[PDB]
């Protein structure tokens, strides 16, 4: 029973160096993937200063995406997104609107089914294995365009810094299925612009909203990956703290057992010798 404690110290110390490695790994991945996150942050801005921000609009059909992580030591990031999924998905509910929920990342596949199982249709996963590219987000936008709602919702975590990732809902409306219908006030605000397309405005907005979905989906799953790495860096920071305080308790209790072992073996030896002399 004195060797159960020594091997438990062995287990806690190897766990405490594993988590300290994974903290530095997450910190290394957070800096060389922030060099790709705030590069892609720019292209979201022309579409929001062109189309605006219309989250609570009365869509007939809506596809909501919660883009989450694939690996699992992120520390309550994906669960916070799973709760903001229903927190922003009940604020849409005004007339009995249809909703399709979709998860990007393996840890959203397991977590939305507990709350919304009949409204689940697609799981995109293995997305951060090599990297995130725009052709990939384009294909995910294509399969979100196969069924064609009137609105899109993307739920992710905006990578502010290595401390805060306050989560974000970004909204993308189908071209004149609801978007220009949300633009017409005493005329319209979209009619200021000269459409310089080949075909009509109804097709330049058709192309323009697929490009907006691809840009928003790319930036969402890039910001979510960088916030995942920083959340894992903050999660394995508390794991080495816990595996150090548990190690210190176990080291103190081992010192007690070591002292008691020497005392009890000594008392046995003295009692053996005193029964002869």
């Amino acid at each position: 029973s004195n060797q159960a404690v020594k091997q438990r110290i062995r287990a806690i110390k190897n766990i405490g160096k594993i988590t300290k490695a994974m903290k530095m790994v997450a910190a290394s991945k957070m800096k060389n993937a922030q060099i790709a996150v705030e590069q892609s942050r720019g292209l979201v801005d022309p579409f929001v200063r062109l189309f605006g921000d219309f989250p609570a609009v009365n869509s007939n059909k809506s596809v909501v995406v919660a883009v989450t992580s694939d690996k699992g030591l992120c520390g309550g990031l994906n669960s916070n997104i799973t709760k903001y999924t229903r927190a922003t998905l009940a604020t849409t509910e005004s007339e009995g609107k249809d909703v399709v929920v979709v998860s990007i990342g393996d840890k959203g596949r397991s977590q939305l089914t507990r709350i919304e199982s009949q409204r689940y249709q697609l799981a995109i996963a293995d997305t951060y294995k090599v990297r995130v590219t725009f052709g990939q987000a384009s294909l995910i936008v294509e399969e979100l365009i196969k069924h064609n709602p009137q609105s899109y919702q993307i739920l992710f975590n905006k990578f502010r810094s290595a401390i805060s990732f306050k989560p974000t809902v970004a909204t993308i409306l189908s071209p004149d299925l609801l978007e220009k219908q949300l633009e017409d006030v005493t005329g319209n605000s979209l009619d200021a612009y000269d459409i310089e397309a080949s075909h009509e405005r109804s097709d330049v907005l058709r192309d323009l909203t697929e490009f907006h979905l691809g840009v928003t989906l790319y930036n969402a799953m890039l910001e979510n990956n960088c916030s995942e790495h920083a959340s894992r860096m903050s999660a394995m920071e508390n794991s080495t703290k816990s595996a150090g305080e548990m190690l210190g308790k176990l080291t103190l209790d081992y010192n007690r057992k070591r002292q008691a072992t020497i005392t009890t073996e000594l008392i046995e030896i003295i009692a053996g010798a005193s029964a002869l002399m």
Partner: protein, 177 residues
């Protein structure tokens, strides 16, 4: 016709009724942009802000005085207080000028907006500087692109985009200044 006037502010107010109250409001893409379209200003004479973007880069964000954009009708130019525009670009050379010096980015196409406040947002996928293309592989690829001509209008439309992009790349690479 616009009976659901949403926004960050309306979603903040309605979201405090159906979500649990301890949850802070989810952020919006509006909260990280200080520049809008209807917010007048940002002009200051001859130079205008050119937000030349890319999915994987930001190629320019400083103010320039004239931008040559390769729209689908043809090459057009943007001076300072230009008319509002949503221009789809064919594959061509976006010329950024600050004076006598010109940087020539050959892009892949993708839209370019001019807003009422004079901000211009060029938004293309692959936006290479024309320095880093070789003049050999373009006709080398267009010789094959002029060969595989099937009845598959998916593949034929891809061939049309191929020969048109490659032809524009050729006509932009022989015509250097």
């Amino acid at each position: 016709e616009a009976a659901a006037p949403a926004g960050p502010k309306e979603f903040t107010e309605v979201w405090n009724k159906k979500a649990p109250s301890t949850l802070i409001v989810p952020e919006f893409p509006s909260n990280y942009t200080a520049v809008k379209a209807v917010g007048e200003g940002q002009v200051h004479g001859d130079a205008f802000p050119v937000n030349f973007y890319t999915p994987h880069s930001i190629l320019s964000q400083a103010q320039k005085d004239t931008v040559v954009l390769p729209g689908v009708d043809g090459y057009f130019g943007v001076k300072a207080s230009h008319v509002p525009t949503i221009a789809q670009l064919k594959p061509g050379v976006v010329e950024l000028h600050s004076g006598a010096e010109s940087e020539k980015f050959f892009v892949s196409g993708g839209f370019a907006f001019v807003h009422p406040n004079g901000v211009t947002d060029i938004c293309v996928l692959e936006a290479a500087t024309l320095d880093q293309v070789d003049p050999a592989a373009v006709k080398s690829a267009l010789a094959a692109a002029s060969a595989a001509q099937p009845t598959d209008e998916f593949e034929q439309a891809a061939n049309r985009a191929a020969i048109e992009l490659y032809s524009a790349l050729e006509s932009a690479v022989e015509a250097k200044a």
